[PDB]
Amino acid sequence: SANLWERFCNWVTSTDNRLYVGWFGVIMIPTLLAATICFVIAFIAAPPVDIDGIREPVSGSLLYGNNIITGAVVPSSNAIGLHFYPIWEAASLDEWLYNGGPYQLIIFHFLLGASCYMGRQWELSYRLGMRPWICVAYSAPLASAFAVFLIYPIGQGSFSDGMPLGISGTFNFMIVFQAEHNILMHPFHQLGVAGVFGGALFCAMHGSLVTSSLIRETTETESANYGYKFGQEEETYNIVAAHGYFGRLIFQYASFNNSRSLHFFLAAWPVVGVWFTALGISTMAFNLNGFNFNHSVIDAKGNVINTWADIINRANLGMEVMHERNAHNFPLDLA
Amino acid sequence: DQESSGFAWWAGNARLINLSGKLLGAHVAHAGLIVFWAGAMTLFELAHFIPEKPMYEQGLILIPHIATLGWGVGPGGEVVDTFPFFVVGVVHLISSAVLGFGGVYHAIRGPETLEEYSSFFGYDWKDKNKMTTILGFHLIVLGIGALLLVAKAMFFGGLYDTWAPGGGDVRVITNPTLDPRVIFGYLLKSPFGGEGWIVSVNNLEDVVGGHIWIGLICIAGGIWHILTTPFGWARRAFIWSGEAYLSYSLGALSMMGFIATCFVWFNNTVYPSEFYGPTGPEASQAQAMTFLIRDQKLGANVGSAQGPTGLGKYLMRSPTGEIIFGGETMRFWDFRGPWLEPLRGPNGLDLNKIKNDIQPWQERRAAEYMTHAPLGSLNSVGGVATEINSVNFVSPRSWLATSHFVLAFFFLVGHLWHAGRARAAAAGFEKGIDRESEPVLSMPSLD
Amino acid sequence: VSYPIFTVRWVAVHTLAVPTIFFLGAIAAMQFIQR
Amino acid sequence: AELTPEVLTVPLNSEGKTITLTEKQYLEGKRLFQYACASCHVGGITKTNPSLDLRTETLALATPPRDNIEGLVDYMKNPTTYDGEQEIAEVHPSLRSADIFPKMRNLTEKDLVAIAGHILVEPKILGDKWGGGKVYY
Amino acid sequence: METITYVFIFACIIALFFFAIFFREPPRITKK
Amino acid sequence: GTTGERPFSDIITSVRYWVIHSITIPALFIAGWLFVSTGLAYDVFGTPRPDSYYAQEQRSIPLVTDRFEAKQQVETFLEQLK
Amino acid sequence: GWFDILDDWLKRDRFVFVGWSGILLFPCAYLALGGWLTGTTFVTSWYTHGLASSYLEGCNFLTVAVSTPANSMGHSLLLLWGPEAQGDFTRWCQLGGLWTFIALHGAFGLIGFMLRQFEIARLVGVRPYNAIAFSAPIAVFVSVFLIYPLGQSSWFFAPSFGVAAIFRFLLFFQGFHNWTLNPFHMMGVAGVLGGALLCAIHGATVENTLFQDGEGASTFRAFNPTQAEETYSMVTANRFWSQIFGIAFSNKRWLHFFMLFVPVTGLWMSAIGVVGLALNLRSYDFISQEIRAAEDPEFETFYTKNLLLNEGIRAWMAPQDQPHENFVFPEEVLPRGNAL
Numbered sequence A: 001s002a003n004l005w006e007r008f009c010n011w012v013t014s015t016d017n018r019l020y021v022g023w024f025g026v027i028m029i030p031t032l033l034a035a036t037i038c039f040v041i042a043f044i045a046a047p048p049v050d051i052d053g054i055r056e057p058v059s060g061s062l063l064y065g066n067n068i069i070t071g072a073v074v075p076s077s078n079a080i081g082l083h084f085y086p087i088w089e090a091a092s093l094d095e096w097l098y099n100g101g102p103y104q105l106i107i108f109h110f111l112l113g114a115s116c117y118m119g120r121q122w123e124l125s126y127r128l129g130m131r132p133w134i135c136v137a138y139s140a141p142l143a144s145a146f147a148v149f150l151i152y153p154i155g156q157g158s159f160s161d162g163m164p165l166g167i168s169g170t171f172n173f174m175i176v177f178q179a180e181h182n183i184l185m186h187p188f189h190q191l192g193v194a195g196v197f198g199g200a201l202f203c204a205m206h207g208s209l210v211t212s213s214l215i216r217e218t219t220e221t222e223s224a225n226y227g228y229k230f231g232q233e234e235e236t237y238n239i240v241a242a243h244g245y246f247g248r249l250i251f252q253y254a255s256f257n258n259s260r261s262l263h264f265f266l267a268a269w270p271v272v273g274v275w276f277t278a279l280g281i282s283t284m285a286f287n288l289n290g291f292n293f294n295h296s297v298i299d300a301k302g303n304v305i306n307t308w309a310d311i312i313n314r315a316n317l318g319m320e321v322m323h324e325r326n327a328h329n330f331p332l333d334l335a
Numbered sequence B: 001d002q003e004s005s006g007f008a009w010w011a012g013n014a015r016l017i018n019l020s021g022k023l024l025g026a027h028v029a030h031a032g033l034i035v036f037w038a039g040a041m042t043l044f045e046l047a048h049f050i051p052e053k054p055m056y057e058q059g060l061i062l063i064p065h066i067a068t069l070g071w072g073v074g075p076g077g078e079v080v081d082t083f084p085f086f087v088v089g090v091v092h093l094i095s096s097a098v099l100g101f102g103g104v105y106h107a108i109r110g111p112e113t114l115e116e117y118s119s120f121f122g123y124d125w126k127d128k129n130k131m132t133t134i135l136g137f138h139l140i141v142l143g144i145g146a147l148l149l150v151a152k153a154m155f156f157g158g159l160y161d162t163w164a165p166g167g168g169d170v171r172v173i174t175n176p177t178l179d180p181r182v183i184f185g186y187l188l189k190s191p192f193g194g195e196g197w198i199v200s201v202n203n204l205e206d207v208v209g210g211h212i213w214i215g216l217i218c219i220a221g222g223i224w225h226i227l228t229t230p231f232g233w234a235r236r237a238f239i240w241s242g243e244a245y246l247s248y249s250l251g252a253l254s255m256m257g258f259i260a261t262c263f264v265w266f267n268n269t270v271y272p273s274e275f276y277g278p279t280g281p282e283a284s285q286a287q288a289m290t291f292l293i294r295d296q297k298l299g300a301n302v303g304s305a306q307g308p309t310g311l312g313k314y315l316m317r318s319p320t321g322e323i324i325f326g327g328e329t330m331r332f333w334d335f336r337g338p339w340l341e342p343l344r345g346p347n348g349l350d351l352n353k354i355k356n357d358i359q360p361w362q363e364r365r366a367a368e369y370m371t372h373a374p375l376g377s378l379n380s381v382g383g384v385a386t387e388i389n390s391v392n393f394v395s396p397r398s399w400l401a402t403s404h405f406v407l408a409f410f411f412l413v414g415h416l417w418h419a420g421r422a423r424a425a426a427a428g429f430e431k432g433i434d435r436e437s438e439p440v441l442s443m444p445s446l447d
Numbered sequence C: 001v002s003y004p005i006f007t008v009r010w011v012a013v014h015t016l017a018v019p020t021i022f023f024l025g026a027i028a029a030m031q032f033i034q035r
Numbered sequence D: 001a002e003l004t005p006e007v008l009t010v011p012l013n014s015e016g017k018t019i020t021l022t023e024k025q026y027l028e029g030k031r032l033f034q035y036a037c038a039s040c041h042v043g044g045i046t047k048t049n050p051s052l053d054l055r056t057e058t059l060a061l062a063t064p065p066r067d068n069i070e071g072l073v074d075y076m077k078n079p080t081t082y083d084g085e086q087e088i089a090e091v092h093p094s095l096r097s098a099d100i101f102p103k104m105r106n107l108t109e110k111d112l113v114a115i116a117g118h119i120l121v122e123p124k125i126l127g128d129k130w131g132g133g134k135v136y137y
Numbered sequence E: 001m002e003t004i005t006y007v008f009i010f011a012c013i014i015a016l017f018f019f020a021i022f023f024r025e026p027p028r029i030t031k032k
Numbered sequence F: 001g002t003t004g005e006r007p008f009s010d011i012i013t014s015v016r017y018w019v020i021h022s023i024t025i026p027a028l029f030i031a032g033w034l035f036v037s038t039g040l041a042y043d044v045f046g047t048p049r050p051d052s053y054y055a056q057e058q059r060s061i062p063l064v065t066d067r068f069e070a071k072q073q074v075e076t077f078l079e080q081l082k
Numbered sequence G: 001g002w003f004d005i006l007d008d009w010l011k012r013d014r015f016v017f018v019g020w021s022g023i024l025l026f027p028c029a030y031l032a033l034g035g036w037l038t039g040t041t042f043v044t045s046w047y048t049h050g051l052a053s054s055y056l057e058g059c060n061f062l063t064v065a066v067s068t069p070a071n072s073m074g075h076s077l078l079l080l081w082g083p084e085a086q087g088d089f090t091r092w093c094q095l096g097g098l099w100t101f102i103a104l105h106g107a108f109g110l111i112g113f114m115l116r117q118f119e120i121a122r123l124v125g126v127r128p129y130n131a132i133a134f135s136a137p138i139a140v141f142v143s144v145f146l147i148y149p150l151g152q153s154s155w156f157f158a159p160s161f162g163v164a165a166i167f168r169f170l171l172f173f174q175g176f177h178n179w180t181l182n183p184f185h186m187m188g189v190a191g192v193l194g195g196a197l198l199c200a201i202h203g204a205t206v207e208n209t210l211f212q213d214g215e216g217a218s219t220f221r222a223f224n225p226t227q228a229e230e231t232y233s234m235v236t237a238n239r240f241w242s243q244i245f246g247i248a249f250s251n252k253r254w255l256h257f258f259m260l261f262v263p264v265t266g267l268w269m270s271a272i273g274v275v276g277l278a279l280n281l282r283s284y285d286f287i288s289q290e291i292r293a294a295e296d297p298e299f300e301t302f303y304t305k306n307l308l309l310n311e312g313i314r315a316w317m318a319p320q321d322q323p324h325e326n327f328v329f330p331e332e333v334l335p336r337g338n339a340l
């Protein structure tokens, strides 16, 4: 043995592993395994949870009357708020499952691991001699999970207001959010869909342009994909013919001819847009909401002339007025 | 001297990585912009400042910073003399011209490099001795500054204490907590609900005291780095380059940016609700107070009142048994505040004090903070997203917290970016994979 | 080269440029309307 | 559809006598109402006590009557409960408590009349909106 | 019955994941 | 990489261009301005003036209730000093 | 022949390619954009929706819109010279004639544009996979702005051309159709979100697996516009993702087709769902859930919660959102939780 620990460090850092367990991996793999196992068990068999701390248990597990679409892992109780609630903080598991214990165990483990997952996306790139910044692109979806699972609860003062772990539970998070923050009328969110729409747009753009400008090397009755071999020297598509077409679709100078300038834009646009949408949730976590144009335009006498912004407000009221029925005792919703 | 044959235009400032002279001009011209803002903004705030009106209702974020240091304020945060505000503003604004001068000078007139025009000021990124030395210099400068606060608090006037015995007022701290067990105890505090870590500071004694420790420790480490070099591990662990050092400081600011966000949002002491707005929990607490006060005057027995869920309309229990406010405000049972504390007992809110020790100044305080919760829109319309235009207001606590989170976040990205490049720059592939010697092609197939 | 003036590009550009400024002028005036 | 002086004619006192405000007074009142009332009385309601609104009818059934310039103005100096059997200047903004409510320090009798007028003119314009809450938004 | 069906499909996807990762077609270079 | 059209760079730089457009560009602007400030725009698109949303007393909306006699119904809405 | 001479002229390589398609594209496309920009600043929605919708009235870039016609109009084409407007232009504007103008014109503008793709591709001699892709945006516009209101009572319930006017279209579909609970919609976002991932991940992958073809740090200049060698290491990228994610591409031709498939398939699925919403054949409820919820007052899921939000949306919005119904909902009939 050259040195146990020295060998250990060499195995971890080894680039010859089927899955690169890195130094970040040493933290990632255990945390992610704890998160997923607890999730899977919860989603199936967990008992109803008193999310709003008003002794009104919400069942979100399969065995308790739910399906995939409705089922979810319910956030910790509102009676707990931002308090740390590990298993060893409960008199029993029965109590722990009642107060939304699993939720914290999952989100904490996930966010931790998902962060290390980003750290690993650097490490492997380092060990392979390639440029970093791939992890920087992954920082945008991660910052959203952080905003949705941690930042918003911190701001609002309770983990019960963090996004639930389920399909329908996610819809609830949105509808309520819109009511209290008017997110559709917020620039950061708008920039978000801009990146997301644009993303899907550009993804289809590039995708189509490239695959349409492929050099012929296949038969008429043979898959056009086989005209490429893993580990080629030259390019498999005519980027000059691609630019020629798209350059005529709009106009030359509004078309890319530099593959590197292309793929940068392909990466920059969605990442930056999602970055803002992540900052949107994080900003509206401190109640800096979207534009309020309610009763803006009024006539010469003073009568209120409605706009679409007002029609939006009515829909918002309905959500506000109806959400969390028995949770409110006082006029203003300040929590 | 420097053009396209170094970096691209949109990466221009990276051409100055090895131009100590000009790279000094930037930092000095930049530092002027910071002083310029602080100065010009203070005067802007003062020019709009209305004395007989709450500061948080006027979009102030610098004048309340001055107020905290015990300047121009008195009993209950009452603004007495606006001259210290005017001074702090104009003095800064002036110093910006001085710094701006040197900045411009060092960047377009003075020596483009320093190493020759002065071996003392000239430096080498890989010179672990010069780096730890320059670091040692700033570690002292920051250290004295930490004592500059201690001096103002203990000698030159004091600070605004909201927890003041006779009610919020400027008080001279003459008993700083120097007990390390207490001081460094904060660092060992949880960051979750209840135990609030650094943000949980609730008295100026600790604030002043803590700063004494920091001031000394900083200068102490300042001297240490002057008279030493990085050890063995310290050298075999870090990356030594101009970019690497930047990255280290970038993540540092990012972390501090997040801590500041939680500070202005949660802390009551070093961020007085008299100058800033009421904190998030404070406002929700106030509503429970207000209507507990109201309905009780209508003849309601708050102690035994049963709400819709059967939990306790006005008063309920915390998970550990303490008597707290009812409703959704159950999440903010960790709130502490001058106006609310005299109603608190050894087991939480005392039903007897609640029943007949409610003071008028508390009722209108609760009403004030309730109708000034940190809720607002981007276009500054106070209230819930469904409110109507009338009250133009957004709590300063909201502005600061959101602004400094965006900055903190992007700086964490700035960190990753510059740290990722530095690792690739050092090892030498930050510009592409070597066509000839492609590392991956030399590794066995995992398939 | 001896470039021309009036071209198809010229037409296109003007179909957007001419109304735009006309609108930008119109909207700019609206900023002073009241009640 | 405009703010005629026909609309700006509001009852001055209990004895039927009326007063006619000007577009200058209205705007000034509206501005002052935002300055020292909107905080709690946005859109004619009362956040710290939703049971009592600024409806003309509600002000009429008050004690004393507060549905006129004189009424409201008196209230802004020495506010009382709905039955008038208790003075509440200590927990309510007023002239005799300007030391407690700094916003009321600047306010002069001209300001008081403008604010009072605003409260009486708004329901003439907005109607049900002025009284009700989110329902009529 | 429903719960069983949901878990089954889920279990099948996880099973697929395994085979997809560790029992893929070895990516061969040049001579493919 | 080139076509018949005269390179924008040259045109936007040519003194002749500005000699022309220092006149043309502001002209359109002032024209659009007048289009609004003279209240003409209000009539071209039937857009109500600030004092033309309701009648003095009326608080109802002039909603068109039938397609074929809409135009006639609309004119009737303008009748009531709306 | 004049035809081939007409052809010659059209298919001439200019700065802005015209072509045969251009005869359809440019007229419509210009009037569509023009019609919007016109109504956006001048035309009102008072007589049709009881709404201000132009800069002239005080609306801003967010609150402006070209609102749909009244519900009275029905599915009328609303021609300028039609029975409604009767040649009158001002009336035409006040009856929301500009909506059907923008819609129908823009519709043909989308037809011409794809034709352009087809026409230009043929000339350049490239495959028309750019036209196939553009079918997804077509289906959406057709299904949402045409098919959907054609299933409803009138054009009135179509999405109005405007920023805010689209946000209510979202909230409406939530409140009334429970659109988020629709499987076709889920596939929709799965395509768009997943497509916005492929876009991101692939670009970042390429920029950070590049070869060194220059001596500068800004590797943008170091690209060869004339094909030759691959500008980025496809082999390194493969091994990377194979170790961090477990799965990785290894066939650029498939990778790029996949980038076409995912977002185009998604939008198509979202279209079908909307086509079903035209007949109101929505995915509103789960019968098994409701039946237990009726008998058992203690059964609560995140699904039941949402429906309560929908009832609130419908009740509080319908009056001012559907003026033609003359809705009058007394305060006591309005569904409300406690305190709020």
Ligand code: CLA
Pocket (backbone or CB within 6 Å): B009, B010, B011, B012, B013, B014, B246, B250, B410, B411, B412, B413, B414, B415, B417, B421
């Ligand atoms: C202490 C802070 C700090 C410092 C000293 C540097 C220093 C440097 N960075 Mg940088 N960076 C930082 C923070 C910092 N960074 C953060 C927080 C991020 C995350 C966003 C980045 C992201 C970043 C990238 C992506 C790149 C650099 C690069 C560089 C180098 C060249 C400088 C450059 O490109 O200027 C050029 C400056 C500009 C082009 C100006 C950009 C303008 C911004 C994007 C808009 C700001 C919005 C503004 C607030 C709104 C104003 C409104 C407007 C209408 C007026 C230089 C060493 C470049 C490099 O070569 O890497 C080594 C490079 O490519 N940085």
Ligand code: CLA
Pocket (backbone or CB within 6 Å): B001, B002, B003, B008, B009, B010, B011, B012, B013, B014, B015, B016, B022, B023, B025, B026, B027, B029, B030, B097, B098, B100, B101, B104, B107, B108
């Ligand atoms: C905080 C902002 C800041 C600062 C301090 C600097 C500072 C600097 N940049 Mg720079 N830069 C910045 C932002 C900044 N940059 C941004 C945002 C970009 C992206 C657009 C760039 C892009 C860029 C490039 C591409 C290059 C630099 C370079 C330089 C250096 C030489 C400047 C030069 O060529 O002088 C030229 C000076 C002039 C042409 C005259 C400008 C007028 C002066 C400087 C401003 C006067 C200020 C004030 C009005 C006067 C007050 C006087 C009063 C005190 C009496 C200098 C250290 C160069 C370099 O690497 O150095 C070799 C270089 O090539 N920068």
Ligand code: CLA
Pocket (backbone or CB within 6 Å): A272, B037, B058, B059, B060, B061, B378, B380, B396, B399, B400, B403
């Ligand atoms: C960063 C710290 C900070 C904070 C917390 C504040 C906070 C405040 N400022 Mg302030 N200010 C700042 C910096 C800051 N300022 C700076 C640096 C300047 C110099 C330009 C000013 C100049 C200034 C003026 C002149 C005024 C204020 C006012 C105010 C108050 C009202 C807020 C408001 O209406 O803004 C709302 C502002 C916005 C909604 C703009 C948001 C802009 C975002 C950040 C753009 C982000 C886009 C992004 C960068 C795009 C890049 C992406 C691209 C690269 C792809 C509030 C207390 C006002 C006041 O005191 O009146 C009561 C006032 O009149 N500020």
Ligand code: CLA
Pocket (backbone or CB within 6 Å): B024, B028, B098, B099, B101, B102, B103, B105, B110, B111, B114, B117, B118, B121, B122, B141, B144
């Ligand atoms: C970050 C700040 C900083 C730094 C590191 C330097 C560094 C330098 N400057 Mg300089 N400068 C600065 C700011 C700075 N400057 C500013 C703001 C201005 C505008 C007024 C100038 C104007 C300026 C000119 C006009 C010249 C220099 C020159 C020089 C170089 C020769 C050294 C010298 O002149 O010192 C000599 C002085 C001393 C060693 C002692 C000065 C001590 C002062 C008087 C007290 C400072 C008090 C301080 C604020 C508080 C610290 C105490 C605290 C620890 C308790 C050197 C590289 C010269 C040059 O280019 O030569 C190569 C030159 O001609 N500077």
Ligand code: CLA
Pocket (backbone or CB within 6 Å): B132, B135, B139, B187, B188, B217, B218, B219, B220, B221, B222, B224, B225, B228, B229, B230, B231, B234
């Ligand atoms: C911001 C100011 C600053 C900076 C940049 C540095 C920088 C440095 N110091 Mg240092 N130092 C400072 C202030 C500073 N010092 C002060 C004020 C003192 C006096 C107490 C010292 C005393 C000091 C000593 C005695 C030594 C250094 C050393 C070093 C070098 C190696 C550091 C290292 O490897 O840490 C890496 C740190 C670790 C591997 C430990 C990680 C575990 C951390 C502490 C806990 C987890 C952090 C957590 C995320 C934060 C939560 C807070 C916590 C309380 C819960 C480096 C150049 C060493 C050196 O080379 O000497 C020249 C050395 O031996 N420093």
Ligand code: CLA
Pocket (backbone or CB within 6 Å): G023, G024, G027, G028, G031, G077, G078, G079, G080, G081, G097, G100, G101, G102, G104, G105, G108
């Ligand atoms: C080729 C481009 C093109 C196309 C396809 C359209 C298409 C359309 N426009 Mg249009 N338009 C265009 C360019 C175009 N426009 C231009 C350039 C302008 C600016 C002047 C306009 C201005 C405009 C306005 C102002 C209006 C339209 C409208 C319409 C729509 C209904 C028109 C209609 O009934 O068609 C009728 C179709 C034809 C006339 C085609 C007939 C072709 C045959 C072969 C000729 C036969 C003639 C002969 C006499 C017949 C003898 C038979 C005998 C029994 C009598 C339709 C979608 C209306 C609309 O959008 O309503 C909502 C509307 O009000 N257009």
Ligand SMILES: CC1=C(/C=C/C(C)=C/C=C/C(C)=C/C=C/C=C(C)/C=C/C=C(C)/C=C/C2=C(C)CCCC2(C)C)C(C)(C)CCC1
Pocket (backbone or CB within 6 Å): B025, B026, B029, B030, B032, B033, B036, B090, B093, B094, B096, B097, B098, B099, B100, B101, B103, B104, B107
């Ligand atoms: C380098 C460079 C740069 C930068 C620059 C800078 C950054 C500068 C700075 C500058 C500065 C930083 C400046 C400053 C100035 C200041 C001043 C000059 C001041 C003045 C003051 C005064 C005058 C005062 C007085 C007063 C009072 C007391 C009150 C009343 C009023 C008054 C205001 C009058 C740039 C980017 C551009 C470019 C590149 C290069």
Ligand SMILES: CC1=C(/C=C/C(C)=C/C=C/C(C)=C/C=C/C=C(C)/C=C/C=C(C)/C=C/C2=C(C)CCCC2(C)C)C(C)(C)CCC1
Pocket (backbone or CB within 6 Å): C015, C016, C019, C020, C023, C024, G030, G031, G033, G034, G035, G036, G037, G038
């Ligand atoms: C309807 C109609 C028609 C048509 C008309 C037309 C065609 C018109 C046009 C018009 C137009 C054509 C207009 C235009 C306008 C435009 C505008 C108004 C624009 C504006 C702009 C702006 C405002 C910008 C902004 C921005 C952006 C966007 C980005 C960033 C930056 C900035 C800020 C710059 C006709 C007669 C045929 C027939 C009848 C009816």
Ligand code: OEX
Pocket (backbone or CB within 6 Å): A156, A160, A161, A176, A180, A323, A324, A327, A333, A334, A335, B328
């Ligand atoms: O949790 Mn969901 O919902 Ca944010 O707000 Mn307050 O608490 Mn509750 O009320 Mn609304």
Ligand SMILES: [Cl-]
Pocket (backbone or CB within 6 Å): A172, A176, A322, A323, A324, A325, G305, G306
């Ligand atoms: Cl809910």
Ligand SMILES: [Fe+2]
Pocket (backbone or CB within 6 Å): A206, A210, A263, G202, G206
């Ligand atoms: Fe690609």
